[PDB]
Design a protein around this ligand. Structure first.
Ligand SMILES: CC(=O)SCCNC(=O)CCNC(=O)[C@H](O)C(C)(C)COP(=O)(O)OP(=O)(O)OC[C@H]1O[C@@H](n2cnc3c(N)ncnc32)[C@H](O)[C@@H]1OP(=O)(O)O
Ligand SMILES: CC(=O)SCCNC(=O)CCNC(=O)[C@H](O)C(C)(C)COP(=O)(O)OP(=O)(O)OC[C@H]1O[C@@H](n2cnc3c(N)ncnc32)[C@H](O)[C@@H]1OP(=O)(O)O
Ligand SMILES: CC(=O)SCCNC(=O)CCNC(=O)[C@H](O)C(C)(C)COP(=O)(O)OP(=O)(O)OC[C@H]1O[C@@H](n2cnc3c(N)ncnc32)[C@H](O)[C@@H]1OP(=O)(O)O
Ligand SMILES: CC(=O)SCCNC(=O)CCNC(=O)[C@H](O)C(C)(C)COP(=O)(O)OP(=O)(O)OC[C@H]1O[C@@H](n2cnc3c(N)ncnc32)[C@H](O)[C@@H]1OP(=O)(O)O
Ligand SMILES: CC(=O)SCCNC(=O)CCNC(=O)[C@H](O)C(C)(C)COP(=O)(O)OP(=O)(O)OC[C@H]1O[C@@H](n2cnc3c(N)ncnc32)[C@H](O)[C@@H]1OP(=O)(O)O
Ligand SMILES: CC(=O)SCCNC(=O)CCNC(=O)[C@H](O)C(C)(C)COP(=O)(O)OP(=O)(O)OC[C@H]1O[C@@H](n2cnc3c(N)ncnc32)[C@H](O)[C@@H]1OP(=O)(O)O
Ligand SMILES: CC(=O)SCCNC(=O)CCNC(=O)[C@H](O)C(C)(C)COP(=O)(O)OP(=O)(O)OC[C@H]1O[C@@H](n2cnc3c(N)ncnc32)[C@H](O)[C@@H]1OP(=O)(O)O
Ligand SMILES: CC(=O)SCCNC(=O)CCNC(=O)[C@H](O)C(C)(C)COP(=O)(O)OP(=O)(O)OC[C@H]1O[C@@H](n2cnc3c(N)ncnc32)[C@H](O)[C@@H]1OP(=O)(O)O
Lengths: 189, 189, 189, 189, 189, 189, 189, 189
């Protein structure tokens, strides 16, 4: 009962960024695959994440932070995190996502991204959500395309993939391109 | 016995803004339906609400904060919160209200608003209580009209409803329009 | 040359909220006619205004503050102040205005309000600008109507006019109702 | 002699971000045309810019700030500012530029951007410089293309131009696409 | 389960710099053989190491710190520490390593250094990793050569070995010289 | 008379790091040629150098800082700076040097480096002075070789020269290789 | 197992300056015989020693502090303390030693001093260790001579022995005079 | 008249450590010959000496600091500094002295040392004054011997002279060996 779920899809759900899961967040974020995908170069320390959680909690006015839940089992189980950094001046947000090691390839990222778009469009009233993703990270590309993002173009020589200088793909999503039924509309009506 | 009730109506009651219910207040306020109705765009964090409760408690000179109780059962059960921000210079207040997910449609909002008007008129000696409500939120409109509010007009393009730009309805209530018997008069006489 | 002018109309102009004019701002704001029109009940002290100017200058992210200039003479002469309090979450702002004692009835308020609407619509990208004005203040009503505001309705018994309890008129303006040519479009094109 | 010039082109030059010009920087940055082009919605206050200059000066490890000079006259005259925010983890920077009101259309922006690219590529050893520009700002588009930037694509509905929701163009530049002779190579050899 | 392992080789592995092992780190670092090899002249105090651990944890942006694990047994057992001090301006790092007294000569240092090179090249995207080692410390020389380092030369009279003034050997490693299969590539692909 | 000179050679001299020359030090250090030679990527701000001078002055226990003087004229004129960072544990120091734009190629760097070696060997009693220099910086190589440094080797891919990844040359000097007469011996005997 | 031993001789050993033994250190140091031998005139208080231990632990860069162990029994038992105050500028240290009341005359001081010399010469790379000892303290003289110290001379009238003004003997030791096998060489080879 | 003189000999005198001469003290102390003689390895900064003067002035309970005066001219002229660090527990002090560059070889050091001994013996009531001097510094040896010091012995390999490891000579002086008439006795009788 402690694990609150706000948005419930068919396969995934979103809930708040609970403080009981800060060590799990640290372990997910310091996985080498996530470091490669994000492009972070150094692991962070657990003490520093524990300290940073308080500042993350205080600064919530222009930031969405969710814990994604796998709803295929009897009870929800957290599988990753999603975040949108909101710029209230232009109604846009920047989207990032990562899942745990054992939860990838099962589709949870696609519906997690779709639910994040639903929340950002229909609760936050954002006009555009955009992301930057390293070009070789093709799985994320496909997940974002099916979630509702569209390709803008490639920013040449702007990241490292396994030490090699590679481009990164810029993608964006707009409310009129949002696929599938919206859970938030079900909440309101 | 810990749950203090000040005003007791037929279906609802009002009591103080107890500190034992801060987590319940957070869970009510972060529900997506309440976020849509209020027009808030980002969830707040539990730590930030816990911190803010102390400041809310200290600043009570020009602020009413109540917990609404359902009195239909054997014991009172809290179902929502009501607040009036008081401007002592002109004897007016701004009214907001929200209930929990499972308590809507049973009428508790109407008598909660009516009791809030009774307290604001007959204890706080306010000359006018007003509110701003998004136009598509028709249930709140009907509840406010039966509680004692009257429509002023529509403020065009001043809010978002499911990402769509919509108007909001301005309403106000005056003591000479207060319907039904007053509990506070029963307290005094 | 010290008096910077950003927007130049036919009769009026807008510039920044200069620190050399804080005493003039205090004298304008403490005039009994402005106190009656705004509904403020006590004069403020010059020391307190001098202290507050620094905090006003620091907090500029969601606030417009202009000094209105009379451009009918050889050089600009400041005649009043205009302000818009911006709510970035919904792209709306609340508008207030006052002129000095000897500058009223010459039309400067109308073009000052119109230029403020031009700036708020075409630079700040606001969807709605609204105001609250005491009903007996009919001159302000006419000035706002010709500037581009439209009447919403009356909030009953929500202010004092010469000690008498009176209503206040709510007005709003939208970009599609903005009259006349826009100076900002001339800046851009 | 006080105006230091580091890079000297045919028409323009770059020098340090001198503290004697903070008021001129404020006046340039608060011009309505620059506010429209950048997409900033509120003017900043002179006191706040004066305070911020110290923090800008202290934080120079990952930030380039230049004052652009017009070298067509007998002595250099500052005409604008250029900045690159450096991300040392991936050797990339984000580029912004603005000129004063009377210096546009004379070409100074093109060589200012080209010299900024020369410095960023050949002194800072950056692999990619990128920018975000509102689509209707076509003059900046042409200036950036001739300076050495190439178009990536359009980020849909991510900015306001005169209150209208418009897209913004993403551009980037790489060392192998840098046009013309490099001044920095002349410094070294 | 508390002992996290990120990189797993055949004989060794790398994990985070856990706080539960600060006393073990102190005992390893104060061993006379490690003091001779590093060239440190005075033992450090346990209280000072306990204090320093917090500062080491906070400063992780340009520093790699690993605990090396022996994976030959049923469960991982920590045997030493490796560190890379990163200079993000030029994509280079300085490498140091020490093992516990009973774990030397079994090969763990070679694969620990190789895995550190793998992480530094393929996650941190470093172009060069270099080290300084006292010339008489021939075992470390052989371990570094087989791990992937190459000899640069000798810095004359720049260290003490058992009180005698001796030279130190400078070595470096580049990605194109990295031997053997990379674990990180297995993580990504 | 204010310009103190400690060591006087035939062409050059060394004196203390006077506070009257902090702006001249800033202008020398921010020259693009010095930034290329040192490998620094961003200019520093004058305010930050002025602040840092106090901390540089306080920390003199393990640091040599000199201003080099040209003694060919009637009076000494400062032409550059030299520094040695001392590690008292092993009696070694790291050497850096830069001259002003108009003073290079006249030989002053060679005798400045030689006098710095004389001071470091015969006053500081250092056993080894070493340096790191980018390989394409051949003039510095020749100056250091004639001053008394000897080549160790090349550290591959450890710096940028005009944006290109290049190696850097490691050099060292020992007292028994110190060429020419020593001024310090003249001071003592 | 808590009692760490670094250097192990035939009769004695040296380990770190453990915090569990601060009261034992106080009791040893306040013994009247140690006060006479050192020449201290007043006892120190236990609270002051407990406070000072933290500062002693923090300042370890130029200070050796050991606890001497008697290794004749089954387990090590601490019998005294040895200290060397290091001057890193000239590679010299000043040596002091005291044992507990019941451990003198059994030889432990001689090997404790010899092991301290071994550590100071072969780990700290000191060129000279010296001491000052009151002339009537003949037992310490003999112990120091057999440990490896040689007599310099007598500093006349520079101490008190039982209230009488007496001279103190100055002694020093150099690596080339170090007697017996070195444990540290066994650690390294 | 500002230059106070306490002790007046035939050729030299001693006075207080005036604050008007802090820059002259810095210039004397940073002369390379004084650095060689004392054995200091790095010059100190003028700001640091100016800061340290206040702390030197406050701590005068166990410290003598004099400015030596040349009394051969019409008025006293300061030529150096002398200091005695007093250990009140045993009535002993450690003596140091340096003169300016142009005042050596004229005998002023001998009478300055003799007057310092007179003050230390007959005002401070010290039983022994001692010094440590590098062995090659033979002029200081002769000056100290004629002033009243006697040789104790040589501390082997405890200093550097022009980079060479040399011994230092230990000397001491006692009241019964004080040569010549005492000025202080003339003050008292
Ligand atoms: C915003 C940024 O900066 S990008 C950073 C992204 N974060 C990371 O990469 C960290 C590690 N990766 C992850 O956490 C996750 O993989 C995410 C969040 C990127 C989402 O990836 P997934 O959850 O696996 O996508 P998902 O599981 O919904 O399925 C995506 C589709 O991509 C396709 N796909 C998967 N892998 C590959 C591949 N290697 N190549 C091509 N296509 C692939 C599959 O068809 C898959 O459909 P299916 O798995 O449902 O059958
Ligand atoms: C002040 C502001 O800014 S408005 C913010 C209001 N807060 C929220 O909307 C948060 C979510 N909603 C709520 O918490 C509650 O619904 C409140 C506080 C608005 C009150 O709503 P309710 O308590 O359901 O009104 P209530 O239950 O007293 O009945 C209201 C009447 O509205 C009518 N009504 C209910 N839903 C609808 C609807 N979708 N359409 C039209 N009419 C409706 C019904 O006839 C109902 O009568 P009944 O339910 O007693 O039979
Ligand atoms: C936002 C709020 O809370 S309302 C607070 C308003 N502030 C104040 O009232 C302070 C004192 N008043 C003022 O500073 C100014 O009068 C303002 C800012 C309200 C603007 O008023 P004005 O500048 O005089 O309006 P303006 O001069 O542009 O002309 C307005 C028109 O109103 C009409 N008008 C003026 N007075 C009256 C009146 N007493 N009755 C009816 N109509 C009138 C006139 O036709 C006039 O047209 P004209 O003067 O150009 O010929
Ligand atoms: C990075 C960002 O976020 S974009 C923010 C850009 N900043 C601003 O827009 C603030 C206001 N504008 C400016 O300060 C300047 O115009 C800059 C910095 C954008 C550069 O613009 P300019 O300096 O005028 O470009 P420049 O003068 O070098 O010439 C650019 C070319 O664009 C072309 N051009 C100019 N105006 C237009 C126009 N309205 N439509 C189409 N093309 C145009 C011309 O052919 C011109 O060539 P020319 O003027 O040398 O004959
Ligand atoms: C970066 C610096 O500043 S150097 C500081 C290094 N740190 C230290 O020296 C502290 C003490 N030493 C250690 O901790 C470890 O010995 C390390 C980290 C240096 C690595 O040494 P090792 O782990 O023993 O190397 P490793 O075990 O992988 O084998 C190295 C090879 O060197 C060779 N080798 C070992 N000892 C010697 C020796 N005395 N002489 C010559 N060759 C030797 C062996 O052939 C060995 O192969 P093998 O042991 O697998 O059969
Ligand atoms: C320690 C480090 O990190 S290296 C950083 C060095 N700093 C810099 O490079 C900043 C800019 N450069 C300088 O300040 C100076 O050039 C220094 C300090 C490097 C010294 O260079 P110089 O003072 O010119 O050397 P110097 O003048 O004594 O003469 C050096 C010799 O190099 C030779 N030389 C000069 N230029 C070149 C060249 N481009 N190619 C080959 N050889 C050259 C000449 O024969 C010259 O002899 P000469 O000039 O007396 O006839
Ligand atoms: C550094 C300074 O300032 S000196 C301060 C020294 N500290 C103290 O004196 C405090 C009290 N004393 C002590 O703690 C210890 O006695 C120490 C540390 C000085 C060492 O003294 P010891 O450990 O007894 O010397 P040790 O036991 O190794 O033997 C020394 C030799 O001196 C000789 N000796 C002992 N006592 C005397 C004596 N009274 N007269 C002459 N010779 C003596 C013996 O032959 C002895 O050989 P042996 O005891 O092995 O048979
Ligand atoms: C306490 C310490 O740590 S020692 C540090 C001493 N400080 C310094 O050395 C700094 C530089 N030197 C000085 O400041 C001064 O020389 C001092 C303070 C050491 C005193 O030296 P002086 O004042 O020259 O001694 P003084 O002038 O009184 O005469 C000393 C005698 O030494 C003899 N002497 C002088 N130089 C030499 C020499 N190179 N070799 C042998 N004998 C010499 C002379 O016979 C001289 O007699 P005279 O000069 O009166 O005819």
């Amino acid at each position: 009962d402690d694990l609150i779920v706000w948005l419930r899809g068919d396969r995934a759900g979103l809930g708040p960024f609970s403080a009981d899961l800060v060590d799990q967040y640290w372990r997910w974020e310091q996985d080498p695959s996530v470091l490669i995908g994000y492009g972070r170069q150094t692991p962070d320390s657990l003490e520093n994440r524990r300290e940073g959680y308080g500042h993350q909690a205080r600064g919530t006015d222009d930031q969405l932070r969710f814990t994604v839940y796998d709803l295929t089992g009897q009870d929800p189980v957290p599988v990753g995190t999603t975040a949108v950094l909101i710029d209230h001046h232009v109604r846009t947000g920047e989207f990032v996502i990562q899942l745990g090691a054992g939860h990838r390839g099962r589709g949870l990222g696609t519906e997690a991204t779709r639910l994040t778009l639903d929340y950002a469009f229909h609760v936050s009233a954002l006009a555009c959500v955009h992301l930057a993703v390293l070009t070789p990270n093709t799985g994320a590309i496909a997940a974002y395309e099916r979630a509702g993002f569209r390709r803008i173009g490639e920013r040449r020589d702007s990241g490292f993939w396994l030490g090699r200088r590679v481009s990164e793909t810029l993608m964006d999503a707009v409310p009129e391109d949002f696929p599938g039924p919206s859970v938030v509309r079900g909440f309101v009506e």
